[PDB]
Design a protein around this ligand. Structure first.
Ligand SMILES: C[C@]12CC[C@@H]3c4ccc(O)cc4CC[C@H]3[C@@H]1CC[C@@H]2O
Ligand SMILES: C[C@]12CC[C@@H]3c4ccc(O)cc4CC[C@H]3[C@@H]1CC[C@@H]2O
Lengths: 11, 229, 231, 10
């Protein structure tokens, strides 16, 4: 997964 | 939530999800310093866009991987439609930020950029003549988020139907006839084809900038750019 | 412009280009691209003819007409393809004797992703149950819309007027089919949002085609070359 | 002009 995936779920 | 909202409640939710207008690091231009300013800004807006998207009704219901796919597909369309909306009161000029209002002459500083400038200015001109409303704007912006990568699902299309109901309802309330409503809807939606066009050009140009080592890109920007391969 | 909704559909239906054929003869990249571009070149001549019959088009200046066509050509080819492919799931009907599935897209580098996209669009049509009447309207909208963005103002107005007429026509068709007002405005949007994806696919094919020209994989006609060159 | 210009004109 990409940086994006985290950014999106935690945000 | 999205599917059972009244059109007024959908307008409100979209209005209070709006990201702020940010500022540029601004302050001569060169091609490197201009791309730097525009990518610094783009990267900072992207963090707000990620947060805005997570406050769009219907977007919140999708899986993480569907959310990501759609954001990847549409991120530059979204930056672009914001830029254009911002630029309405500034004909002949592009308001990337309140401290970064650029004209056509200034677009020439970067290679291949002036063509995209002109397209963006035409888009902004189109919205001004149509007297685009903010409530219509946030509806359009969310349509892009849910639509652009929807073919690259049933639920997504129902939320899109809801946002269509919402646009119409606004037009009707503003006193437009049934015929004027469906015409204006068509006008608004047809501009998205142009916005898609502007995005694919912008995407190629940015990629050309990275290849020519004009500007270094953050990881976030490099991931979004990379999703278009 | 002074035509009924039914006459608009009639006019557009009567102006439809023919479905062309390819050759009857395990594809290389060269053979498939040769066949695909030969077909596109032959379809373009007909497309120029058809555009002159799209109501309101010939009232534009030649320069504008040229511009719109240069802008739209691949989009128009593509939606046409997608429409022929509608009753053939998993497949693309470039010609009645050239039915290609996605695997055969792998015969040319960068092509199968464009295939997948085109196949996704035909699915969408099939789920929506797009009608022929609806289709020719969308094709005509593409022609007038894609390249439109002081007397220059007067010309733009005309195009937006014609565009408004096709929107009325699309709504009239849905109204006659018995769709509620809500369903009418929902379907109009679903139809029009697909145009965004077709723009996307077109931009990608344009780039794919320019690469193929650069590689010298395949000979391109002067026409096909100049349309490519226009972007 | 272009080839397209004549085809459209003619
Ligand atoms: C992507 C580019 C840099 C970032 C630019 C931007 C940056 C911020 C913003 O709000 C909108 C846009 C639209 C145009 C974009 C540019 C088009 C080409 C350039 O590479
Ligand atoms: C333009 C391409 C060759 C011609 C193809 C064609 C050829 C004929 C036609 O009716 C539709 C299409 C759509 C896709 C086109 C292809 C997409 C990429 C390839 O370069």
């Amino acid at each position: 997964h990409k940086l994006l995936h985290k950014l999106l779920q935690d945000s | 939530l999205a599917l059972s909202l009244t059109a007024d409640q959908m307008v409100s939710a979209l209005l209070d999800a709006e990201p702020p207008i940010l500022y540029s690091e601004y302050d001569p231009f060169s091609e490197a310093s201009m791309m730097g300013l525009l990518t610094n800004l783009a990267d900072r807006e992207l963090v707000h866009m990620i947060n805005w998207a997570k406050r769009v009704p219907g977007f919140v219901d999708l899986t993480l991987h569907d959310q990501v796919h759609l954001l990847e597909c549409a991120w530059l369309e979204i930056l672009m439609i914001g830029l254009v909306w911002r630029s309405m009161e500034h004909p002949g000029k592009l308001l990337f930020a309140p401290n970064l209002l650029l004209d056509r002459n200034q677009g020439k500083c970067v290679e291949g950029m002036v063509e995209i400038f002109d397209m963006l200015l035409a888009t902004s001109s189109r919205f001004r003549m149509m007297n685009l409303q903010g409530e219509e704007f946030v509806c359009l912006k969310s349509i892009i988020l849910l639509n652009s990568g929807v073919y690259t699902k049933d639920h997504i299309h129902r939320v899109l139907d809801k946002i269509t109901d919402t646009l119409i309802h606004l037009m009707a309330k503003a006193g437009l006839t049934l015929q004027q409503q469906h015409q204006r809807l068509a006008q608004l939606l047809l501009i998205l084809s142009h916005i898609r066009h502007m995005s694919n050009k912008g995407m190629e140009h940015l990629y050309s900038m990275k290849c020519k080592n004009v500007v270094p890109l953050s990881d976030l920007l490099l991931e979004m750019l990379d999703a278009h391969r």
